[PDB]
Design a protein around this nucleic acid. Sequence first.
RNA 1: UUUAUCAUUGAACUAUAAUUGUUCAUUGAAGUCAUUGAUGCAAACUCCUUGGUCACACACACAUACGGCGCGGAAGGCGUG
RNA 2: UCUAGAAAGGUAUGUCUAAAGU
Lengths: 272, 192, 195, 123, 93, 106, 71
Amino acid sequence: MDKYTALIHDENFSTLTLNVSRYPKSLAYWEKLLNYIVKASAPICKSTEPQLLKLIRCTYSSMLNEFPYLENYYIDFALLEYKLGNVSMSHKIFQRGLQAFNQRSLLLWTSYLKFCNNVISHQKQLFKKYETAEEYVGLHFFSGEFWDLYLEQISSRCTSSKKYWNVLRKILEIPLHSFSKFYALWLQRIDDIMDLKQLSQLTSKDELLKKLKIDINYSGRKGPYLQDAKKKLKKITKEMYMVVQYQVLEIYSIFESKIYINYYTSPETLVS
Amino acid sequence: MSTPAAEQRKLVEQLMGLHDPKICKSYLVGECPYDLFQGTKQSLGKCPQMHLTKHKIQYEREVKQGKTFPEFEREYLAILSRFVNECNGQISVALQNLKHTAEERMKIQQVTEELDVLDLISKRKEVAKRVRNITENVGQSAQQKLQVCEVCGAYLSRLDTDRRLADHFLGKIHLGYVKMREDYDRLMKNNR
Amino acid sequence: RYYCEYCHSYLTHDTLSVRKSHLVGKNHLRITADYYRNKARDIINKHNHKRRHIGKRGRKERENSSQNETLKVTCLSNKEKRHIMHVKKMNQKELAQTSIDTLKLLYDGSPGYSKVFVDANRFDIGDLVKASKLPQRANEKSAHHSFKQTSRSRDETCESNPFPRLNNPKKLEPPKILSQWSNTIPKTSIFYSVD
Amino acid sequence: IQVAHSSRLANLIDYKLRVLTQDGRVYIGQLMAFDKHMNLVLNECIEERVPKTQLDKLRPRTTLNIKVEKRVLGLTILRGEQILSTVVEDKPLLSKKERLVRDKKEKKQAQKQTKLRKEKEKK
Amino acid sequence: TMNGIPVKLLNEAQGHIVSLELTTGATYRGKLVESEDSMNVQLRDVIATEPQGAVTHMDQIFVRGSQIKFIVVPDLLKNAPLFKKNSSRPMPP
Amino acid sequence: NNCSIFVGDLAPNVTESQLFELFINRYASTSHAKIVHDQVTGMSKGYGFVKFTNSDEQQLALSEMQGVFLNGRAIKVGPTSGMSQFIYPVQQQPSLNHFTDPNNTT
Amino acid sequence: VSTPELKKYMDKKILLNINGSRKVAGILRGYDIFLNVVLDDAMEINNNHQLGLQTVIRGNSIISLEALDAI
RNA sequence: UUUAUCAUUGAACUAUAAUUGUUCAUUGAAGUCAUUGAUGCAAACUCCUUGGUCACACACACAUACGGCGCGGAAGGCGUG
RNA sequence: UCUAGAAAGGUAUGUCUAAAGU
Ligand SMILES: [Zn+2]
Ligand SMILES: [Zn+2]
Ligand SMILES: [Zn+2]
């Protein structure tokens, strides 16, 4: 006998399924039923019994229709369908995961973008997905991982290196949990500049000429003037560092230090 | 060979009564011992009787449904028995070499001096000197620490993990000689 | 025959069973890792600057930049610039090596945690991590470390750790700040906090 | 550009070849290796093609402009069964005199390397 | 026999992400486990683009060597030692 | 200045009392003496610090106790004292009146 | 010359795309120096229709060898 | 400008088809994402990389059309030792 | 019938033995 019929005539399956079908909103019964069905196919691959894959899909889909705020199981169900051969279904699994969260979950956007980097293979479409994730879950206090992932894709694909300076200047004003890394990128990247024409990567040339009294087209000895330039831009970055440091340290000391639990858990849990 | 159709020609030509000295009957039963040890360092040379695949699959057909020729079994058992008894002599030689290391002269006089140094609180002094002599015997072991692989006869050790042992036990020598020991156990149970 | 270009050692008749056993040799792996670290270090460290094509400056440019003013240029001694370059190289390496990893520390008790963040039970890269664990045919390699392994199984459920606060939790670490601008912080907090 | 008349493919290393292939595609990349089977190793190649739609514009009857799909491929190796022709496009980054200086310097460094390796293994 | 710089370079990229397009039009891209002497490759954890675009996923694949059109190795193998023109091999055995 | 000297290679049966005795009342009156014992075993790790008030007192102790025989050994009296981007913040405390008390609910 | 390294794919199920268009699945049993392969219980994946009790594919027309089983 | 799966049936239904066409539903195969996409057409703006930014001069030449009569450098052609 | 002397290495691997203080 095969895996499916052997699984059905097992005694535990009727007990686990009757406990789930009696007590739906208790989570541990669902997870016991789910771990048993997955362990009952010990190699999972493309050739395992289709009457049993249909049942693993019905179990995951029905659990996630019961408990729609479970972040880790959307990732896991999508990665299971990604193992089973079709990325077309795993796109839909992540997207209903984002929609049940009304697009504002950080973990599903982070795992969906580290998924989508591999399989979308069209550059402007992948960047439209990063702009979507930015406008929903960008200002999250722990979204350092999203922005660092986004800067990784920008520095590996693009040849222009203007879009990196643009995106990094938007990181510099957001109060993130770990903004000092995104300041150290800006500091070493100012310090890694070489000549006066590249100061227009940051801001416009007239903004420099008015606000910082600095001419890009100053032709002459360009050693001391470039060092003066780097010191004045480092001073402006120090002031914007003070403002973001104040807002981050205020949010952390007062509010974000005290929350210990950020996850859905189960409908039977109590919050302190 | 160099072009792949040449090697393919070689294989099909060696694919295309059944008695006499021309055909190695030991290969015909299976696992000729001059075939299992061709390339290794226990190489016997070349198998004298030729090996051929048409004869072998005719034997597969014959022992599938037709009959069994027990002269082939007694010839294979003779060759198998002489090789297995020869390597039993060689593993006896290997453990003799361990003994001859163990009964070396200067080491025996050193352990004799330490064992004369082994001679209540008298028992505590004797046990401290005997643990020093146990560590002297273990220092002689730390020079070697050799056990003998009981099948192949080659050396082994226990300080070594299971994985480098698993590296040994999937050898050409050890798998070939395990196959020889297993056909010898089968034929000595079946003939008795 | 064969010749390991990285290793600088010849070999006898090139059989795939000899060659493949050389290519996962530990000493060959050290030599290859050194070679590629040094070549990436050389192409980072090589400042090739553009060649200078100096044109003859005009008159009105010469009057304007002769009538601006002259700026002082700062320069440092030899030991100063050597110490500064050692500091700059280690700071660029720790920015390249680090990574924000707070979404892993922050979901540490969640229900489906072992199926996503464990990295050995992941369905996409699940078989690869177990497959590439390596033989460890060295007894003393496992006999070196005497800590626990803490293999979190995939079969874990929601029932264990029912109350996350009572099992002793850790507060999240304060946000790291730049050490060179560490004096610009507000010197007093607002609320009296103890321990 | 003008290439020397007696210049086989062994001599055009570090030029920027333009390898045609069996499908209309073209791999504009810098050559750095080749083989008996003529399967090159192009350094920074850009696989172009003329689409099925704009191919009517090449059909025989201002100028004609064709919009090709540049698709960047980094350090390809080709399979030599596919190649159809190679055309040189651009000269190298270095001169000939500079390549002479650099080749003498590399051979000098290799001979010093083998000298130190020999005298270290004798010690 | 002798293999030369391209097939030897392909043997230098065992373990890393390669991207290869077959002659039928497909494009497979994964970690290259074992290549061979005749450019006969395997690929683990691949992302398989069918010719009309439908991307699927499959655990391992063994293409025939004869069907490959190109193989895109990583960038750093530009600095591989086999591209060095003036080499000084020490001594035969 | 709390000048600290790092004595080392000390004998096992040498106490912090004897380490005080060999450091205090000769060349100085040292403010502290502290040998590092084992945190669960109690047996001295063979090295320990002593804290003198004045830096001239410590260096006078340093030149004279270097190599000096203390309970069977030479006790190696080198001075104990005298580049990451990211550090955790640290802040003062607002001295706890009724406004700056986070539990004040009246 | 050189045998293909299919010692892992022995005695498992395998999906190979014959000649571009067609696609056959079966239980691999043997192979040779050219990549001609012999696979037990071949079913042409199209409503699919089965070939026969044993086949032997000439290895001129194999393009890829996907392994359906765990390997 | 142009596209966005078919079936079995029900209710009606033009109708050679595997009720195709038409609205609504069930069930069933597999099902890259994209429709702010794709294909065609045209312009504007911005930003990169590359070089003798050399020397002499601010000048009245030419039917055999034009002193190719400064120092170099890059690439090719041709001849000699 | 025309005089048979098989290698000697290479790489991979673990273990022993050992060399270091302030
Ligand atoms: Zn035989
Ligand atoms: Zn053995
Ligand atoms: Zn090597």
